[PDB]
Design a protein around this ligand. Structure first.
Ligand SMILES: [Zn+2]
Ligand SMILES: [Zn+2]
Length: 64
């Protein structure tokens, strides 16, 4: 059976999905400060209850 691959070469370049509704944000997506991506509608922190985790890491060299 002469085969090679079944599907399509579509690697995850810059795939982004709203952590609130997973609307696949991108065109106008907003990456919250906490470190997440949301939609223009869920871009606000209060909307997705921003849980910015601070002083929660004791490794690697510091910086500013
Ligand atoms: Zn959303
Ligand atoms: Zn946030």
């Amino acid at each position: 059976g002469s085969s090679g691959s079944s599907g399509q070469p579509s690697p995850p370049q810059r795939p982004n999905r709203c952590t609130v509704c997973r609307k696949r944000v991108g065109l106008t997506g907003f990456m919250c400060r906490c470190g997440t991506t949301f939609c223009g509608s869920h871009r606000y922190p209060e909307v997705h209850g921003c849980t910015f985790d601070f002083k929660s890491a004791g490794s690697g060299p510091s910086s500013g």
